[PDB]
Amino acid sequence: MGGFGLKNPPPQILIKNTPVPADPPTQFSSQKINSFITQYSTGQMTVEIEWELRKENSKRWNPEIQYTANFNNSANAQFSVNNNGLYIEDRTIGTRYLTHTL
Amino acid sequence: MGGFGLKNPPPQILIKNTPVPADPPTQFSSQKINSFITQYSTGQMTVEIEWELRKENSKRWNPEIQYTANFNNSANAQFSVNNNGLYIEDRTIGTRYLTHTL
């Protein structure tokens, strides 16, 4: 599907709500505790990647194809939110534009 | 016409073929020397400019218009020489693409 094959990829990160049981009966029972307190959780996360990139030196004379926002007027701008508040991606953008000698 | 107005612009550079007179007569004459030896000259020149440029930091989310080589197939490539050997410029390329807040 494309990508970087890794022997030792980034570690999976797993999270759970710790169970909080509801009021236990007064008499003892060895069976599992069936009833819990309904709860959920929320909070912010952040991810910081450091990328290394190969600089481009090409002596070709004439200009190259490059990615350009669509040249047309439109009811909704490209890669932007619409009236209802929904973010819309117009195109899958490949990485291959700049030419290189074979 | 656009450009950089300068009080002290780059100096004009002026060049001439030094005159070489033809064979003078044996008797003296005070009039100017009319006849010279036809000659011309040639050689390489070079110019080296150092340009300073303002880096671009813009936090807009969506992509921008950029200059792109014409997307079409053609009998002759853009900004390239043709069969007869003549270099042809397709477009005057303005400098204004990237947006900036007013």
mmCIF file of C-alpha atoms in Angstrom:
data_model
loop_
_atom_site.group_PDB
_atom_site.id
_atom_site.type_symbol
_atom_site.label_atom_id
_atom_site.label_comp_id
_atom_site.label_asym_id
_atom_site.label_seq_id
_atom_site.Cartn_x
_atom_site.Cartn_y
_atom_site.Cartn_z
ATOM 1 C CA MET A 1 0.000 0.000 0.000
ATOM 2 C CA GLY A 2 3.118 2.190 0.065
ATOM 3 C CA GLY A 3 5.136 3.360 2.985
ATOM 4 C CA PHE A 4 8.201 2.590 5.050
ATOM 5 C CA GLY A 5 8.621 -1.043 6.042
ATOM 6 C CA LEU A 6 10.011 -1.198 9.565
ATOM 7 C CA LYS A 7 11.457 -4.012 11.648
ATOM 8 C CA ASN A 8 10.774 -2.119 14.891
ATOM 9 C CA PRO A 9 7.847 0.190 14.139
ATOM 10 C CA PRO A 10 6.404 2.752 16.550
ATOM 11 C CA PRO A 11 4.843 1.091 19.586
ATOM 12 C CA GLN A 12 1.124 0.597 19.863
ATOM 13 C CA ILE A 13 -0.467 2.763 22.543
ATOM 14 C CA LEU A 14 -3.353 1.227 24.458
ATOM 15 C CA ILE A 15 -5.724 2.884 26.916
ATOM 16 C CA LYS A 16 -8.670 1.803 29.055
ATOM 17 C CA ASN A 17 -11.125 3.168 31.589
ATOM 18 C CA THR A 18 -10.386 1.514 34.907
ATOM 19 C CA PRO A 19 -13.544 -0.304 36.063
ATOM 20 C CA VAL A 20 -15.442 1.172 38.993
ATOM 21 C CA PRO A 21 -17.920 -1.324 40.473
ATOM 22 C CA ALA A 22 -21.345 -0.335 41.717
ATOM 23 C CA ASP A 23 -22.542 -0.895 45.272
ATOM 24 C CA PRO A 24 -21.735 -4.470 46.312
ATOM 25 C CA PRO A 25 -24.267 -6.530 48.260
ATOM 26 C CA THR A 26 -23.888 -6.845 52.004
ATOM 27 C CA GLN A 27 -23.708 -10.644 51.981
ATOM 28 C CA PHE A 28 -20.623 -12.173 50.418
ATOM 29 C CA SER A 29 -20.647 -13.759 46.964
ATOM 30 C CA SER A 30 -17.700 -15.240 45.085
ATOM 31 C CA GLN A 31 -19.126 -14.630 41.606
ATOM 32 C CA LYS A 32 -17.746 -11.870 39.414
ATOM 33 C CA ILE A 33 -18.997 -8.330 39.840
ATOM 34 C CA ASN A 34 -21.437 -7.819 36.989
ATOM 35 C CA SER A 35 -22.669 -4.267 37.573
ATOM 36 C CA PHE A 36 -20.398 -1.248 37.160
ATOM 37 C CA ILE A 37 -20.761 2.522 36.956
ATOM 38 C CA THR A 38 -21.182 3.871 33.440
ATOM 39 C CA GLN A 39 -18.399 6.314 32.641
ATOM 40 C CA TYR A 40 -16.166 7.546 29.833
ATOM 41 C CA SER A 41 -13.203 9.869 29.455
ATOM 42 C CA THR A 42 -11.719 12.511 27.188
ATOM 43 C CA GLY A 43 -8.634 14.660 26.844
ATOM 44 C CA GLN A 44 -6.051 16.016 24.458
ATOM 45 C CA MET A 45 -3.207 14.108 22.810
ATOM 46 C CA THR A 46 -0.234 15.365 20.819
ATOM 47 C CA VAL A 47 2.198 13.845 18.323
ATOM 48 C CA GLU A 48 5.511 15.301 17.189
ATOM 49 C CA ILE A 49 7.356 13.732 14.247
ATOM 50 C CA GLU A 50 10.831 14.684 13.039
ATOM 51 C CA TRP A 51 11.233 14.186 9.305
ATOM 52 C CA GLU A 52 14.476 14.166 7.327
ATOM 53 C CA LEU A 53 14.306 15.292 3.724
ATOM 54 C CA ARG A 54 16.545 15.151 0.664
ATOM 55 C CA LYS A 55 17.304 18.513 -0.907
ATOM 56 C CA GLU A 56 16.782 18.915 -4.648
ATOM 57 C CA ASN A 57 19.493 20.027 -7.068
ATOM 58 C CA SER A 58 18.585 19.762 -10.741
ATOM 59 C CA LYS A 59 20.140 21.719 -13.564
ATOM 60 C CA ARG A 60 17.365 21.248 -16.124
ATOM 61 C CA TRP A 61 16.696 24.482 -17.968
ATOM 62 C CA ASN A 62 12.929 24.479 -18.422
ATOM 63 C CA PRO A 63 10.252 24.690 -15.717
ATOM 64 C CA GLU A 64 8.623 21.683 -14.082
ATOM 65 C CA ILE A 65 5.178 20.431 -13.253
ATOM 66 C CA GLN A 66 4.180 21.403 -9.736
ATOM 67 C CA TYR A 67 1.166 20.992 -7.513
ATOM 68 C CA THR A 68 -1.151 23.967 -7.819
ATOM 69 C CA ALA A 69 -4.451 24.789 -6.186
ATOM 70 C CA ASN A 70 -7.296 24.470 -8.631
ATOM 71 C CA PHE A 71 -7.263 27.518 -10.934
ATOM 72 C CA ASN A 72 -11.021 27.709 -11.017
ATOM 73 C CA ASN A 73 -13.519 29.770 -9.068
ATOM 74 C CA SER A 74 -15.771 27.587 -6.946
ATOM 75 C CA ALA A 75 -18.683 27.709 -4.542
ATOM 76 C CA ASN A 76 -16.413 26.183 -1.881
ATOM 77 C CA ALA A 77 -12.670 26.704 -1.614
ATOM 78 C CA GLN A 78 -10.336 23.738 -1.908
ATOM 79 C CA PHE A 79 -9.452 21.822 1.262
ATOM 80 C CA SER A 80 -11.763 24.024 3.301
ATOM 81 C CA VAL A 81 -14.929 23.928 5.370
ATOM 82 C CA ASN A 82 -18.362 24.429 3.788
ATOM 83 C CA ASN A 83 -21.491 26.223 5.050
ATOM 84 C CA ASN A 84 -22.588 23.285 7.198
ATOM 85 C CA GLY A 85 -19.201 23.087 8.911
ATOM 86 C CA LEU A 86 -17.810 19.953 7.251
ATOM 87 C CA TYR A 87 -14.168 19.755 6.177
ATOM 88 C CA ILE A 88 -13.743 18.388 2.649
ATOM 89 C CA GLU A 89 -10.583 17.083 0.976
ATOM 90 C CA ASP A 90 -10.529 17.643 -2.773
ATOM 91 C CA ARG A 91 -7.587 15.619 -4.041
ATOM 92 C CA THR A 92 -5.262 12.844 -3.023
ATOM 93 C CA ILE A 93 -1.935 14.509 -3.684
ATOM 94 C CA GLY A 94 0.832 12.283 -4.913
ATOM 95 C CA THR A 95 4.409 13.023 -4.045
ATOM 96 C CA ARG A 96 5.881 12.742 -7.549
ATOM 97 C CA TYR A 97 6.175 15.938 -9.597
ATOM 98 C CA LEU A 98 9.821 16.950 -9.866
ATOM 99 C CA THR A 99 11.645 15.067 -12.602
ATOM 100 C CA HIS A 100 14.900 13.186 -12.114
ATOM 101 C CA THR A 101 17.177 11.508 -14.637
ATOM 102 C CA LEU A 102 16.813 7.745 -14.827
ATOM 103 C CA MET B 1 8.142 49.828 -15.901
ATOM 104 C CA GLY B 2 8.860 48.089 -12.587
ATOM 105 C CA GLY B 3 12.124 47.541 -10.853
ATOM 106 C CA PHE B 4 14.415 48.944 -8.198
ATOM 107 C CA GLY B 5 14.962 52.690 -8.339
ATOM 108 C CA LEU B 6 18.573 53.435 -7.455
ATOM 109 C CA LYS B 7 20.421 56.637 -6.634
ATOM 110 C CA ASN B 8 23.782 55.060 -7.517
ATOM 111 C CA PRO B 9 23.003 52.314 -10.030
ATOM 112 C CA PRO B 10 25.545 49.881 -11.473
ATOM 113 C CA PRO B 11 28.131 51.665 -13.605
ATOM 114 C CA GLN B 12 27.904 51.693 -17.360
ATOM 115 C CA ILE B 13 30.642 49.663 -19.031
ATOM 116 C CA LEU B 14 31.986 51.017 -22.303
ATOM 117 C CA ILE B 15 34.347 49.358 -24.771
ATOM 118 C CA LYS B 16 35.964 50.284 -28.080
ATOM 119 C CA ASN B 17 38.349 48.909 -30.675
ATOM 120 C CA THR B 18 41.486 51.021 -30.580
ATOM 121 C CA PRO B 19 42.014 52.529 -34.052
ATOM 122 C CA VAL B 20 44.871 51.167 -36.138
ATOM 123 C CA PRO B 21 45.708 53.469 -39.063
ATOM 124 C CA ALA B 22 46.662 52.189 -42.485
ATOM 125 C CA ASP B 23 49.947 52.995 -44.199
ATOM 126 C CA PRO B 24 50.594 56.742 -43.957
ATOM 127 C CA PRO B 25 51.944 58.663 -46.947
ATOM 128 C CA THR B 26 55.632 59.456 -47.107
ATOM 129 C CA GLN B 27 55.131 63.218 -47.367
ATOM 130 C CA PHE B 28 53.752 64.948 -44.301
ATOM 131 C CA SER B 29 50.141 66.106 -44.049
ATOM 132 C CA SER B 30 48.441 67.734 -41.072
ATOM 133 C CA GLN B 31 44.930 66.541 -41.943
ATOM 134 C CA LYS B 32 43.297 63.751 -39.973
ATOM 135 C CA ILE B 33 44.035 60.151 -40.852
ATOM 136 C CA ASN B 34 41.011 58.996 -42.816
ATOM 137 C CA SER B 35 41.910 55.404 -43.695
ATOM 138 C CA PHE B 36 42.167 52.683 -41.054
ATOM 139 C CA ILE B 37 42.419 48.900 -40.947
ATOM 140 C CA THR B 38 39.088 47.109 -40.738
ATOM 141 C CA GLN B 39 38.948 44.979 -37.610
ATOM 142 C CA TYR B 40 36.607 43.733 -34.897
ATOM 143 C CA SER B 41 36.889 41.792 -31.660
ATOM 144 C CA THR B 42 35.180 39.124 -29.593
ATOM 145 C CA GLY B 43 35.485 37.374 -26.261
ATOM 146 C CA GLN B 44 33.617 36.101 -23.244
ATOM 147 C CA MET B 45 32.077 38.164 -20.447
ATOM 148 C CA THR B 46 30.631 37.087 -17.112
ATOM 149 C CA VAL B 47 28.258 38.613 -14.563
ATOM 150 C CA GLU B 48 27.722 37.484 -10.982
ATOM 151 C CA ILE B 49 24.835 38.930 -8.958
ATOM 152 C CA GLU B 50 24.179 38.310 -5.266
ATOM 153 C CA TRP B 51 20.485 38.420 -4.433
ATOM 154 C CA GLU B 52 18.914 38.637 -0.981
ATOM 155 C CA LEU B 53 15.497 37.087 -0.540
ATOM 156 C CA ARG B 54 12.729 37.166 2.054
ATOM 157 C CA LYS B 55 11.713 33.774 3.400
ATOM 158 C CA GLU B 56 8.023 32.876 3.429
ATOM 159 C CA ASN B 57 6.105 31.857 6.547
ATOM 160 C CA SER B 58 2.348 31.572 6.109
ATOM 161 C CA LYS B 59 0.009 29.522 8.242
ATOM 162 C CA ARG B 60 -2.897 29.324 5.794
ATOM 163 C CA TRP B 61 -4.365 25.838 5.756
ATOM 164 C CA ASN B 62 -5.254 25.292 2.108
ATOM 165 C CA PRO B 63 -2.877 25.046 -0.861
ATOM 166 C CA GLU B 64 -1.855 27.981 -3.030
ATOM 167 C CA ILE B 65 -1.606 28.858 -6.678
ATOM 168 C CA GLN B 66 1.866 28.177 -8.013
ATOM 169 C CA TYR B 67 3.648 28.442 -11.323
ATOM 170 C CA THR B 68 3.467 25.173 -13.217
ATOM 171 C CA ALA B 69 4.796 24.119 -16.588
ATOM 172 C CA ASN B 70 2.014 23.776 -19.101
ATOM 173 C CA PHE B 71 0.151 20.512 -18.411
ATOM 174 C CA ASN B 72 -0.344 19.820 -22.076
ATOM 175 C CA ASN B 73 1.553 17.688 -24.554
ATOM 176 C CA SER B 74 3.090 19.787 -27.305
ATOM 177 C CA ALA B 75 5.132 19.563 -30.476
ATOM 178 C CA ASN B 76 7.816 21.672 -28.772
ATOM 179 C CA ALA B 77 8.586 21.684 -25.063
ATOM 180 C CA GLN B 78 8.179 24.877 -23.070
ATOM 181 C CA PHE B 79 11.152 27.247 -22.842
ATOM 182 C CA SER B 80 13.178 25.011 -25.133
ATOM 183 C CA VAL B 81 14.831 24.930 -28.534
ATOM 184 C CA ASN B 82 12.937 23.801 -31.646
ATOM 185 C CA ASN B 83 14.049 21.769 -34.685
ATOM 186 C CA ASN B 84 15.648 24.766 -36.389
ATOM 187 C CA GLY B 85 17.705 25.606 -33.306
ATOM 188 C CA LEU B 86 15.821 28.681 -32.080
ATOM 189 C CA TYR B 87 15.164 29.231 -28.376
ATOM 190 C CA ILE B 88 11.560 30.223 -27.649
ATOM 191 C CA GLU B 89 10.112 31.730 -24.467
ATOM 192 C CA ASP B 90 6.503 30.750 -23.852
ATOM 193 C CA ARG B 91 5.332 32.983 -21.024
ATOM 194 C CA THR B 92 6.241 36.140 -19.191
ATOM 195 C CA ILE B 93 6.199 34.861 -15.636
ATOM 196 C CA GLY B 94 5.021 37.274 -13.007
ATOM 197 C CA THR B 95 6.392 37.118 -9.514
ATOM 198 C CA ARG B 96 3.078 37.181 -7.633
ATOM 199 C CA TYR B 97 1.517 33.836 -6.703
ATOM 200 C CA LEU B 98 1.813 33.288 -2.959
ATOM 201 C CA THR B 99 -0.915 35.065 -1.019
ATOM 202 C CA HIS B 100 -0.301 37.401 1.901
ATOM 203 C CA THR B 101 -2.739 39.060 4.283
ATOM 204 C CA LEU B 102 -3.465 42.695 3.514
#
